[PDB]
Symmetry: D2
């Protein structure tokens, strides 16, 4: 399995044509699962899930989708509330691929997209696995913006390698994961005019009209599927107190918390995350 061997494009209609890039693996396997990556500058499907896609593709038909604004998907300068935008694009892709009801796995912004998708198209989303998710999180104790969100904002205003390394270091417990190679690769993708345009567009999208669409903690009481919330105890972007409304109100919720783990559970606790996800989605 390589980036190039798994690479696919589709064109969907979201206020006009929208190119989506995704990775496909495990084509032999009956159970389809959709993977939605985190939203840090320069993030994309293959790098977000590099420790997961091969293991999951042994069990499932994996569709890892670059969200609009990321990777090789289109990077429009203008769009509405991001999670609803991304959810509409994914729904376009489900229809094109002939999918019915499919489980979704999403970290951070991708968790927000997975939830918005499961609320807007309830019959299309099966079981959800959500790692340090946006949208259904509401930090009952942590003052907003969090240390993590403030470092992301600083990069948006001053997109330097130093500001990117600072944001990456508050995303993990083990700061040695933030290697010079990782910083150089993320920064090369994040600093392009097309990426910076998307990065800011996405910021502006969460304030003003349709802010309510981002307050998904108000709505997840309506989810009827099993939902596995996964958190790093030391998440400094979407901290653990953000899990409590979702855990209380989602009828078939579970929560797993990992000590000595920040915001990148799928990287920092890859083996434990892989085994939880395989068991929760029925072993395939």
């Amino acid at each position: 399995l390589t980036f190039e061997s798994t690479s696919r494009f589709a064109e969907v209609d979201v206020d006009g044509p929208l190119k989506l890039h995704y990775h496909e693996a495990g084509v032999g396997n009956d159970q389809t699962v959709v993977l939605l990556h985190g939203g840090g500058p320069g993030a994309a499907s293959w790098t977000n899930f590099s420790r997961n896609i091969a293991v999951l593709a042994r069990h499932f038909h994996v569709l890892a989708v670059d969200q609009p604004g990321y990777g090789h998907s289109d990077k429009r300068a203008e769009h509405g509330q991001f999670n609803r935008y991304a959810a509409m694009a994914l729904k376009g892709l489900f229809d094109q691929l002939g999918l019915g009801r499919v489980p979704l796995v999403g970290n951070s912004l991708g968790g927000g997209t997975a939830v918005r998708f499961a609320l807007d198209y309830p019959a299309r989303a099966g079981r959800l696995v959500l790692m340090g998710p946006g949208g259904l999180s509401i930090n009952l104790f942590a003052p907003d913006p969090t240390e993590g969100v403030k470092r992301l904002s600083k990069f948006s205003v001053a997109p330097t390698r130093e500001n990117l390394e600072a944001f990456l270091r508050v995303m993990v417990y083990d700061k040695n994961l933030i290697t010079p190679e990782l910083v150089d690769q993320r920064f090369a993708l994040a600093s392009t005019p097309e990426s910076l345009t998307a990065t800011r567009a996405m910021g502006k999208s969460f304030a003003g009209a349709d802010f309510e669409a981002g307050m998904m903690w108000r709505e997840v009481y309506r989810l009827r599927q099993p939902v596995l919330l996964i958190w790093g105890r030391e998440d400094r972007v979407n901290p653990l107190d953000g899990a409590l409304v979702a855990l209380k109100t989602i009828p078939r919720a579970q929560l797993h918390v990992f000590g000595q783990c920040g915001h990148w559970v799928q990287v920092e606790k890859f083996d434990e995350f892989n085994k939880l996800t395989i068991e929760f989605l029925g072993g395939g």
Copy 2:
């Protein structure tokens, strides 16, 4: 595997001779694990872990120990702080069986014993799996005593079948698990003069001198092993808010919460509990 085929006794010295009953299975397997049951009237090892012992014994050398006051272990009318008493008995058994460092699995009172054991004899306890545990739990939001503890107290004062059924119903989410057969079997064991004597002795043991020994949330910052806390979201005896000091202060802690699950995780979520415990203790 039957109650009779697995039954064992040992005599240990705890302020004089103390008979301990336990169940042994998986004698072929290299990794020993000790199971410590919950403390409800009439509880014992075989009935507490009936959905777990056979599955665990495929992977591990299982020692499921009737705590002093329960099952076929001695039921003294007088003893100190219960968890320290039970921990001293277990340590006597470890020495007799020639055990070094062994992981422990404990629900409720047994979780309290497992923790007291891991604090008092730190080199003898490996990984801990603790389900709705006593002792390291401190209910930061729930007024004490909880609905669950009050129903246990009512049975101690008025040991009727009706008061026992009432206490059992607040221990599970799915009240159909509290069958007439289960109520009749627990009540027959709970109502014996020997059991009632132990039941009250144990009550009196948690107030007065050595109350600090029961406040293990003050001490678990010192635990150096991985610890898997497991809770039912709807636990009405040791509610979920009781997990937070332990999750914060134990360096290598994890937490799993099950929605639609009360105080008997090992029964109500037996399959998920079994798989979590097997993976966490290294698959054996």
Copy 3:
């Protein structure tokens, strides 16, 4: 000041004529305040706020309104979501009496009504004082129904003196406040056929398809006024964990928690409660 001397009636229109009873004191004081009582069987304005009306009436023009279904207000057999029904009745009274923007003080059910009113008619509500409030509370840790709600339901199905006493005992920290006289007085009011009709109508409304209007924790981010949340640490009906979403999402929120205090803050901490309310509402 007596029940009789302060007693007033108004007729308002909510799907037809609705008689409201209220108590008026401190006439000619510059600032009007409306008090809304809790919803336990036999509750009413005068008995709910007897340790408060005389003191508040030194500073404020006090209107203590019997909500529909309570005291001498009309006791209809059917209504929609209770808080919106009560808020529509209160709006009728505000219009009839010519009130502009008035601060509201509400405990439990009355706190829910005060919030529903402040959301639906934002220009008519000033500062809110909410004591163990319903509606905007969501018990993130406590399994629902709570011990307090379960004892209320038990009375509703078997309206005996013993079941009322059991419900009143989980309302207070100091169970000596639950005197034979209090039990007798409340039982007499709660067991009339009209009062039972109202309590049975309350049950159907809370589990009808109108339930979303009750989930005011979803909506209080919209409140623009200062809001003083007041909780008994030992509240067993609406426990302290129910404060957290409102404290987080109301911009100008404050929270005060009293140790050694249950659900009846205005009785068990009457002096401290009076003093907080007088200062928060501007001294009068």
Copy 4:
């Protein structure tokens, strides 16, 4: 009232002579109260409590004590656990001035000292008012170190004007309180060689083998007096989740949380803070 008019010195003995500086006002008022300031670089009694001393001195005999290492009190290069060191200094002052049982008001580091004092010398401490206190706080949700503590450490390693400004900005909700004049005044006091010696001695003491005496969340169940915890909802140094163990375990605890308020409650909510403290301590 001025810095100069209220300035007093005492010599006490803690492993040898120790000069303490304090401010005295309201002499001849029946009730003495001791104020203990927070621990930010350049902090001292007069600047910490300038919006409070004049008001409190109308009701109380105020002693505002510069803790060892701050203001004009001695700045030793080495000491044990800071709160016990400061509590031993305060006991020396109490004995020297002939004080009996005195209520204590402390913010942050000073709240830790007030608690250590109330635990070690229980007959000498009355009612406690603790604002965003250290020591008895344990951040159950917030990863440690907090954004606030990290900016303090950054100043300690690189004691520049820019790093001090960055630390002062996470102390307050309204960043306009952090004026060039405030930064200039604090930087001047914080960057003297004696003050840097004291701040470097503070660092070593908090990560020395004396750390257990700092974990006062383990011990405050012993406090017998009424304790008023006061928190800014937006506290980024000692965040609100740090209140929960103390609120649960102190028998006569109260908590007050101000929305739109950071770590400096006594500055950002000075009027409401003064009024709460005056009422709680008995009006004087």
